[PDB]
């Protein structure tokens, strides 16, 4: 049937939310690098 609930091939949430970057440390620098892996 077409009314029986089936799960989709691509499961879970299909979107992501950007996260705010860290607060810049108050040295004399403009270049701020978030923790780099």
């Amino acid at each position: 049937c077409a009314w029986i609930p089936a799960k989709p091939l691509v499961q879970g949430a299909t979107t992501a939310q950007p996260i705010p970057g860290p607060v810049p440390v108050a040295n004399g620098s403009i270049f701020q690098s978030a923790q780099p892996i």
Binding site: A26, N27, G28, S29, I30, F31, Q32
Partner: protein, 303 residues
Amino acid sequence: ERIRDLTSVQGVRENSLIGYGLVVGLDGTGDQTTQTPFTTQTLNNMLSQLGITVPTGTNMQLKNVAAVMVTASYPPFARQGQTIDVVVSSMGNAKSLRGGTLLMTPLKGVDSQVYALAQGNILVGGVNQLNGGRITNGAIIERELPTQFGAGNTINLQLNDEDFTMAQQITDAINRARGYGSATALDARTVQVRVPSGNSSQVRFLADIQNMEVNVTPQDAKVVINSRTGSVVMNREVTLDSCAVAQGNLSVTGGSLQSVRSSANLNSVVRALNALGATPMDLMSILQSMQSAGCLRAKLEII
């Protein structure tokens, strides 16, 4: 006096600003806009912002306008309202920026935030460079940076050149002047100074320190060779060892194998090397071979 000429202070640094702008007023020595579309596009953006909408897909060929990149240096402790100097550089098929004027241009940091606004008249030297100019007091500071100067009881003097004896000399001088336990060397490039807590007391301390005088210790023997410009420089620590040298067209003033005596000071080195009668061009090759053999008791750097 001297320490201010050898070190910098931690937290007191410069940053860089860059922006895009237009230069108007040229005597027909601007871009050929049929090959630089961003020129006409940004001119249309400016006109639209001012209140004039030019129809799209129309003919437009200017001659008195050039698209430029503006670069500046954000100074330490900069306050809003002050002024800095900017450098203006052409960026497409322009002939000259002789008598141009820079229109309102925002200067962004690396985080894409506006830190200064630039506008003024360009001074081109007037051979000389035509597509590059400098504007004096051409930008005004709009944003300020936070800093943690004055917080804590420790500053760091950062040497300009690594050395252990030099860091120890600076430490000993500061301790001789400003009390027993005032300074401490961390490594070959840092001196940690204890300062009273506050903002004015630290300024008094750094004003007292920056004008002290220290005697520079002998550095490393080194020979700098700039092959691109064709220059050779040897500081006062270079020595030599006795050895023979041969090179094309060079002879004794005798065969082609010339002797070189030992040399303790620099005058002896200059004399013994001038004895060979070689241009700097050949002197480079001679010095490289001598360093490879073992005569040259120095440190060769090709810059």
